[PDB]
Design a protein around this nucleic acid. Structure first.
Length: 127
RNA sequence: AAUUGAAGAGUUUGAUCAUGGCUCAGAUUGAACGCUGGCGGCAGGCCUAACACAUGCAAGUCGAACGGUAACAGGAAGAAGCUUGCUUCUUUGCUGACGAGUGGCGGACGGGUGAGUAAUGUCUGGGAAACUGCCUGAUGGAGGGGGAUAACUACUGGAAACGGUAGCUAAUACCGCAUAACGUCGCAAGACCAAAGAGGGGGACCUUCGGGCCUCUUGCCAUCGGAUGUGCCCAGAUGGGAUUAGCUAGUAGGUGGGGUAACGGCUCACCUAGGCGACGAUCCCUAGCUGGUCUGAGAGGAUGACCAGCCACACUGGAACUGAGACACGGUCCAGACUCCUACGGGAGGCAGCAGUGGGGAAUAUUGCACAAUGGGCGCAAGCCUGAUGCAGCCAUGCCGCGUGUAUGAAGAAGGCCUUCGGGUUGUAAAGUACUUUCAGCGGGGAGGAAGGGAGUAAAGUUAAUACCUUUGCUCAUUGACGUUACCCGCAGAAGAAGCACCGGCUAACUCCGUGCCAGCAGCCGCGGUAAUACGGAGGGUGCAAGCGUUAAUCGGAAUUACUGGGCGUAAAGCGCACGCAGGCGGUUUGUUAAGUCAGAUGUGAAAUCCCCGGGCUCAACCUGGGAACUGCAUCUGAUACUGGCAA
RNA sequence: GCGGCCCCCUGGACGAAGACUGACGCUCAGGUGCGAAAGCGUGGGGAGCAAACAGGAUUAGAUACCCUGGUAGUCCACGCC
RNA sequence: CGGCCGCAAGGUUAAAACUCAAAUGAAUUGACGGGGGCCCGCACAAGCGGUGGAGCAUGUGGUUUAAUUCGAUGCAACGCG
RNA sequence: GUUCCCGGGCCUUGUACACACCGCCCGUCACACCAUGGGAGUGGGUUGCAAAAGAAGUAGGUAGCUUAACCUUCGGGAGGG
RNA sequence: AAUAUG
RNA sequence: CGCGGGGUGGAGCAGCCUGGUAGCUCGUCGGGCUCAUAACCCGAAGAUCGUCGGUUCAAAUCCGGCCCCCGCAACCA
RNA sequence: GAAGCAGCCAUCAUUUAAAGAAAGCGUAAUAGCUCACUGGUCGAGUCGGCCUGCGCGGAAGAUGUAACGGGGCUAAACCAU
RNA sequence: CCAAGGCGCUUGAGAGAACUCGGGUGAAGGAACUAGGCAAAAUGGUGCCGUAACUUCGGGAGAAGGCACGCUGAUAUGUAGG
RNA sequence: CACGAAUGGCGUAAUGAUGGCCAGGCUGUCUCCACCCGAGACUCAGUGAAAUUGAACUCGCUGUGAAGAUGCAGUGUACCC
RNA sequence: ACCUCGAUGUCGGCUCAUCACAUCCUGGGGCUGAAGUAGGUCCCAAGGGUAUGGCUGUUCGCCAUUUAAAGUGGUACGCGAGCUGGGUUUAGAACGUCGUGAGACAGUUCGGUCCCUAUCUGCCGUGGGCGCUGGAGAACUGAGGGGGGCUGCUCCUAGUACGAGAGGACCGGAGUGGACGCAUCACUGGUGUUCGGGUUGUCAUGCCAAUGGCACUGCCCGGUAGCUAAAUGCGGAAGAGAUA
């Protein structure tokens, strides 16, 4: 990075701009969807397969998930397999039958809830 | 005057003897770093980016080759204001001169650098078919004419650099003709080629009274010579690599033409088909070399800055001119990279010259003084120029000299340190007393490097000329950059001036305290896990000194690539075995040749330098006389045992 | 490196006496030939044995030692290494 | 790595970086060998009686506790000091 | 009784052992680190071979254009640029 | 027979 | 609402025409062997015969239920 | 430039007609300028909800008025008779 | 491109527009088009020189990439050869 | 997810109207298309088809509608050819 | 599952549009945690404008570098009697997977015909008849209807307002480009097979000479007029009226 310069104010701005680009970027964690599990199946792909019904919001192929019952996280992960009816698909929306299983998941309890959530960058700027 | 020269130790094991590596004590350096540093002498001091550069300086010189007044210094005449006899101001080359300019010579030398360059180069020894400025000896000419042109004037383009148009004007510049062998070309007869004048002074004849003309000095020209300088050619020697084995079309040879100062595939045309190659061609990597330096007992090895010889290069790349000599470090042209200035149209530059700066790197210096001296360029000399050179500045970088006191001094002071707490030590050291004052500090004096050159005189030589000039004597004025010189004399008062490494074994020199297998030391083998002679600190001790130590670097030690001077049964090492070409070596007898070899002699082997014997710098280092060495090589003359050749 | 028998072709060393040639020698980088066992190419042959590989034992484990089978190979021709 | 040979496996020619101070030879003494000979002891053999199970005595380890004083632990400690 | 076991003595033999088999010592794997070979390729430098290119300068040739010294018949030739 | 590690 | 065979201690096991003190392996906890450890050896803990009614002196041994695992059917979000 | 209104706390009372240690603009902060509360003045209706009748807004779409059939209507609507 | 020989395709005649068909050409840029350099274009002969990785050693190969090329005269009243 | 060693694996020169990709050349393929020359398309003369067709004096818009109206309703617009 | 299986030919692209406003940009305003500025958000506003490429079956999307700005939707996911046929419902073949298999896969790869002369309506241009009250010729009024309606950058106002400084204006003026449309050949260019020249091969004109024919206009170099865009002139307005 080679600069021979004009005015000192632009230099004081460009060091601040460099620091701002340097700065760690993300902060926001917000739900995309909520889904309810019923009727477990077993599979060699992932161990167990939790049949699901998405109760609220949208479900997308790769996002972090929180599998929870009554304010405890039962199991933790990133959304691994999104299956609808008989085929893996990119996305699913509330009121729809689904299946999901995660590698080394064998821990299904019916009536547990999956919260799938979107993570959004912000890029802080020094001032 | 000359052969006095060679050391080993530590370390593999429980222990030993071998083999064998590793490591150290040595010497040395264009050194750096670390810590510390008083003065002096001498020597030496960018080995990195052949990277780029601000500003200044680095060769010009002759009016005695020439127009000239652009200088400006006088003089005169004249024109004028008067100071009234002188000042003043326009002319004037009259005159001491002298810018720009013309012409000649110098700019091709010296200085700097090590990029490229493995031989085309270099070194040694020989050679033939060559030229060679200036500079000297010899023999003779130096006759008679002519045309331009820059400068300079009048115009005119330009920001600047730098010019344009038209006339005028000289010359030791330029060009014809005459004149010409002993010269060139030819068998000869013959043909043809040169010139330049300038300067000083002077009786006679005379002069368009400018000088003609005489006489002296010098320059011009041709030729035969000298010494010098350079080009050319051949042999041998002169880095590394075979995991580079094939290489050469102008290549190799011939003839003829052309070309160079000259031999020449030097270059063409044509003809022939060779050349080089295991004694390492070719290619690649790498490098300036030698006389020498350094090391080494020698043999050898490493190294080639300093110093000198030679070669090569000069922003990158190429070519030619001028000239005696360049394919030109501060010349030219063109092309390229790149840098700058600018009015933007168009122009400018090559510090590896001396200083000096950026950058680089561990790291190598003052933008000094002077032509006083030596040696150069030009000139007749004066003179001028000389960043060559002579000197100084800076740096403990190296070498070397000297000082930082001397003598006395026991109560063997205190303190420090140890201490079986008896004492011991630090330590005659200190303290004290008696002395000396180098070198510094300060005030005074003063060689040599200066011989010459200049000016004036005289003689002698010269001449038609007591001239006039040179030579050779004499005499008088002078000529020091460094320089507050070297060196000497006088004064005060121990005053101003000692640090650094190391102490287990190697390896000279020992205890205590702290830390406690931590922290750290280590060149090598190794030390430290609470009593560390190996760490940290102190005390003590040893080595060495204005330096000391570490590091890097090379040789040594290393007979550890072994020629001198090694091994290979089992330690690393004999191809699995054999036949065989090139290569090495060869029974025994006689003759011969004399290559190798051995002897002798001459020439050469640069000088510096090393060595041996001397001298001189206040003494050494350093400087310097003479000799030896000059270890080699070539040619020539000899010897004939041995080896080789040849003959039986 | 070659051990049954016999033949054919055919190598060399050594002795014996005697004869002849008359240094024709010794060694040899480069180069060339030969060169066990294993292995490879093609086509045959294959009784034993024996990699591989299998199974049964042993053992903590035993894909080994040990034991039972058993392929390539071991055999031959001609080539190669 | 490159060259060369070879069908390939492979052979041949043949390094450097780097790392470590020993690698290593023979020989000597000892110790050791599931090496050998020789040879002895309640070593085994041939026998007799016991311990190890039971209950108790005492010591040890360990546990526990305010303290369970401290040392001793293969033969060569545990009715030990 | 001395075959077997433990322990011990003598001789002889073997040895990479000498804090003496309770010795010593091999290689994978796991781990960290260091250098190095290969590597689709990428980026430079150098350079052979074969062509294009052709400034400037020299050398060679010039029915043009232009021109002071020599020749001349005074027109021009010769010569130069 | 058979027996591993310090 | 679907075809096969099994259930004995912590885990895995023998009892089949032969219904007569539930014992044997692997782990677990102790003891022995060794200088010490693995290894090895001797031992101890360990139960309604899955669960029920019948069977019946005593039970996979003789039945039917409940239930569980495996067998294949066995989906396969 | 804080004394109610930039801050933090007290989350109360006094003086008092009436004034809450005060709600805002304002002031550099008080003041200024008012509110809450009341006096003077003037002059009679005044203030907030509730239940029902009828409207207003909430009301953005795709070829052209394009959600009274149209012109057009405040009765030619709506409600009751 | 012509000879001998044989033919002028059984509707014509006028306009000279979109657009379609068969063709020629083009500034500047040179695959940007598009599923895709498809289609057009460009190369194209002989002789000589020269020619890589790699390879079953034949190849690769015409590799790649260049140079010469008309006409007239002379060598030769038209030579070498037939 | 869900290769595989004769339903062959992996190498492979030469080869290919083969598949994918990229480079250079070259261009109206294109940014961005223009012009012209030929044959139709047009007028005239002659000859002369074909698919098709419930019947028709065969308008737009909005809405309705066996749910996307030339014919309906409402409305607008429209010389005849 | 109401229209359509005695046929409404299915995704995307290209060419060609058109409307809606829930407005991407340009306009006008309020509030702003609105210093300037750059913004944020909401309302009103549909006239005009509203990117090329890399990637791919490609919508979408990712990514590029731009621009006043790269709108969201409707229209048989506008548009195949206009075009493409890569994707996608044909027949080949293969791979994986599944099935004993024939075969299948909503997994994939390589290959693989887009028909039709326009009657009517509709739509774009240009005519004939008749009417308009005697007939005829000319020039107009303008009822009515369409096209046009874009925006960057520079300078001045002003380095002012505003602001600590940096930075950096409103509003109102003056130029000069892009985009796009209309006009048009003087210029620069293009074409220019009816104008000229060169040139290869061959035939004919008796022959030589000089021409002519033919070979893509044989090949090829030039170029008049006309027509042309890549050439060069111009355009978008100001203002008024009535209002959100």
């Amino acid at each position: 990075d080679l600069r021979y310069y004009s005015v000192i104010y632009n230099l004081i701005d460009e060091v601040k701009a460099a620091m701002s680009g340097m700065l760690s970027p993300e902060l926001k964690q917000q739900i995309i969807g909520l889904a309810e599990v019923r009727d477990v199946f077993k599979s060699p792909k992932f161990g167990a397969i939790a049949g699901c019904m998405v109760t609220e919001g949208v479900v997308k192929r790769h996002n972090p998930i929180r599998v929870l019952r009554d304010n405890v996280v039962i199991y933790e992960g990133e959304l691994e397999s999104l299956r609808r009816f008989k085929d893996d698909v990119n996305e699913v929306r509330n009121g729809m039958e689904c299946g999901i299983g995660v590698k080394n998941y064998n821990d299904v309890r019916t009536g547990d809830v999956i919260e799938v959530f979107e993570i959004i960058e912000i890029q802080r700027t020094i001032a």
